[PDB]
Design a protein around this ligand. Structure first.
Ligand SMILES: CC(C)(COP(=O)(O)OP(=O)(O)OC[C@H]1O[C@@H](n2cnc3c(N)ncnc32)[C@H](O)[C@@H]1OP(=O)(O)O)[C@@H](O)C(=O)NCCC(=O)NCCS
Length: 147
């Protein structure tokens, strides 16, 4: 019943990448998660049942914030894990003078879309043919969350 939330560290990347492989359509490589270890990128992980079950990564840029990725292992979904991770991330962003969280997500990524909408996210635009798809390209929906 213990649950731990903390900033992520380089040792977390293999499990984070495993969560991505399990949960995210078109998942980031292990090397993509090293890529946002660098400055202005901030991450958190949740530990439940003695292992990592979800992570969230934001980018602080200009005066506002971008949600780069959020994912929860499928066996731990629909229990509030992402909700808690997002709350922790938004507390950090709000303390660092941000008020709007940007998310870009594949049009077909239903779960991330419905999650963000129930957190207060609002669609503000579409980037057509923004992601590579198995054939052709896939639109990105663009959401804003005020906080
Ligand atoms: C989106 C995601 C992180 C949600 O994680 P989670 O821990 O299950 O989310 P929560 O339990 O905190 O969600 C909260 C509310 O979101 C809504 N919702 C969440 N997932 C949903 C889904 N798959 N389908 C429909 N509604 C959903 C629910 O209304 C949920 O509230 P409830 O549990 O009271 O029913 C998870 O589906 C995931 O990892 N998806 C793939 C990740 C991804 O694609 N990342 C890249 C784009 S950011």
């Amino acid at each position: 019943q213990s649950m731990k939330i903390r900033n992520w560290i380089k040792d977390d990347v293999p499990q984070v990448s495993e969560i991505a492989e399990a949960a995210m359509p078109f998942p980031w490589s292990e090397k993509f998660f090293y890529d946002c270890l660098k400055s202005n990128y901030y991450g958190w992980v949740m530990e439940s049942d003695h292992h990592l079950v979800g992570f969230i990564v934001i980018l602080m840029q200009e005066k506002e914030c971008q949600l780069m990725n959020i994912a929860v292992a499928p066996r731990y979904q629909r229990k509030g894990v992402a909700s808690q991770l997002l709350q922790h991330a938004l507390h950090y962003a709000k303390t660092h003078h941000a008020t709007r969280l940007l998310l870009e997500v594949r049009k077909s990524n239903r779960s991330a879309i419905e999650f963000y909408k129930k957190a207060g996210g609002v669609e503000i635009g579409v980037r057509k043919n923004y992601y590579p798809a198995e054939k052709g390209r896939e639109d990105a929906l663009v959401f804003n969350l005020n906080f």
